[PDB]
Specification:
monomer; 88 residues; alpha/beta; de novo protein; de novo designed protein; monomeric; NF8
Length: 88
């Protein structure tokens, strides 16, 4: 059973792709990179026969969805408030 992830720092890119590709499962968090791990950890508990696919470009996501060889598709979006602290 194959899982397809899409990751983006920008919400409009993920929204516009979801609308052209026909996908509805969208998640958003300031901790985008920790959320990815927290989802994949639960995939490993729920799907012992999992296959991992992960994307950052709509040409790659569209090429995979053209073939439709996937059991679930999930979009993850970064929240606007996250920045690191700096002292120099």
């Amino acid at each position: 059973g194959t899982i397809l992830i899409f990751l983006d720092k920008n919400k409009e890119q993920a929204e516009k792709l979801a609308k052209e590709v026909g996908v509805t499962e969208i998640y958003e968090s300031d901790n985008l990179e920790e959320l990815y791990r927290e989802i994949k950890e639960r995939i490993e508990r729920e799907n012992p026969n999992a296959t991992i696919l992960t994307v950052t470009d709509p040409n790659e996501l569209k090429k995979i969805q053209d073939e439709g060889k996937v059991d679930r598709i999930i979009l993850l979006i970064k929240g606007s408030l996250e920045h690191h602290h700096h002292h120099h």
